[PDB]
Amino acid sequence: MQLTPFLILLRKTLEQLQEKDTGNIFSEPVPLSEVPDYLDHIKKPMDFFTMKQNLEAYRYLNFDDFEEDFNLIVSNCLKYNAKDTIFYRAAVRLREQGGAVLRQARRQAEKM
Ligand SMILES: CC(=O)c1c(C)[nH]c(-c2csc(N3CCNCC3)n2)c1CCC(C)C
């Protein structure tokens, strides 16, 4: 397919995913200065600002590479935070609500 419509769709999809993060807790990198142990078990931090940078740097050329980074946002938060926290439940909610956004976008991408 053609590059420009695909990037437009990824931009729209990323905005829809960010809208599901109502607390904006995934909008910028986890502040490593305030979480010194974050990287002890988190191999690759991810957040929506970094995703936007990657999108605009042409790093996402298929849907699965975009979805992989979204899945890291979720999985990193589930891994670091205890189950009884707001952050763990926020990642569950984002997995569910964002999963629906992504399925719809992939169906748009497949019609291109
Ligand atoms: C660990 C985690 O999954 C996180 C996610 C998804 N977002 C953020 C976040 C955004 S801003 C911020 N601040 C600024 C105010 N002081 C506290 C740290 N933390 C975290 C770290 C939370 C930890 C400190 C309990």
UniProtKB/Swiss-Prot annotation:
Transmembrane annotation, as ranges: none
Tissue range of expression? High levels in testis.
Post-translational note: Acetylated by KAT6A.
User: Please, which domain of life does this record's source organism belong to?
Assistant: Eukaryota
Coiled-coil annotated spans: none
Q: Where in the cell is it found?
A: Nucleus; Chromosome; Cytoplasm
**All copies of domain Bromo, residue ranges:** 1-105
Its signal peptide is none
User: What disease is this chain connected with?
Assistant: Intellectual developmental disorder with dysmorphic facies and ptosis: An autosomal dominant neurodevelopmental disorder characterized by delayed psychomotor development, intellectual disability, delayed language, and facial dysmorphisms, most notably ptosis. Additional features may include poor growth, hypotonia, and seizures.
- What assembly does the database describe for this protein? Component of some HBO1 complex composed of KAT7/HBO1, MEAF6, ING5, and BRPF1. Component of the MOZ/MORF complex composed at least of ING5, KAT6A, KAT6B, MEAF6 and one of BRPF1, BRD1/BRPF2 and BRPF3. Interacts (via PHD-type zinc finger domains) with unmethylated histone H3 at 'Lys-4' (H3K4me0). Interacts with trimethylated 'Lys-36' of histone H3 (H3K36me3). Interacts with ING5; interaction directs BRPF1 to H4K4me3-enriched chromatin at the 5' of active genes. Interacts with KAT7.
Q: What does this protein do?
A: Scaffold subunit of various histone acetyltransferase (HAT) complexes, such as the MOZ/MORF and HBO1 complexes, which have a histone H3 acetyltransferase activity. Plays a key role in HBO1 complex by directing KAT7/HBO1 specificity towards histone H3 'Lys-14' acetylation (H3K14ac). Some HAT complexes preferentially mediate histone H3 'Lys-23' (H3K23ac) acetylation. Positively regulates the transcription of RUNX1 and RUNX2.
The protein's name in its UniProt record: Peregrin
Q: Which residues of the full protein are shown?
A: 628 to 739 of 1214
